Design a protein around this nucleic acid. Sequence first.
RNA 1: GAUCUUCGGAUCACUUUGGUCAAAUUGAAACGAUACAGAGAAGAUUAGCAUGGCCCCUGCACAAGGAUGACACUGCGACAUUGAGAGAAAAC
Length: 84
Amino acid sequence: KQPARKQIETRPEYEMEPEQPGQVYNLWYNKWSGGMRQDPLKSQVKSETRCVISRDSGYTKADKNPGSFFCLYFARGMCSEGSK
RNA sequence: GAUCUUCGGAUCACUUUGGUCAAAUUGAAACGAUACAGAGAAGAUUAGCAUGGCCCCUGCACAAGGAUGACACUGCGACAUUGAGAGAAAAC
Ligand SMILES: [K+]
Ligand SMILES: [Mg+2]
Ligand SMILES: [Mg+2]
């Protein structure tokens, strides 16, 4: 019964280069190509973050809209906009 | 708000939002490598041009190439049975 709070203060930026020798970015298909397929499942960092309703759920600007949808960033647990 | 008008009002303008889709692991493709075999025509080496399409790739191309691009190239029963004999069975 209290307004929702932002989980992460910062913004997850993108800067990472797999397999430094054998990978090269692809402008059209926005990901790194070349190098060993490496794996189908191996790649799977662990969510650094995690959310729970108890300490995180609350009011937000979208409650007014009847057909509004849930935050893609809340469920994985880094929605940084809070109630806004 | 500007313009007149006479303190009644009139003019002037009048409804956006190009959306492969919300800050990139789990809805834009296609694969590296390692291990196996491993280069068309009836001996051996070898030119090629074709046929077929839910196989494509390079190409501006209705040129031409990719191993002659690759794969494929077969096969069966609208057979009517009687021709006859033998033991059984049922029958001349
Ligand atoms: K040849
Ligand atoms: Mg050819
Ligand atoms: Mg051919």
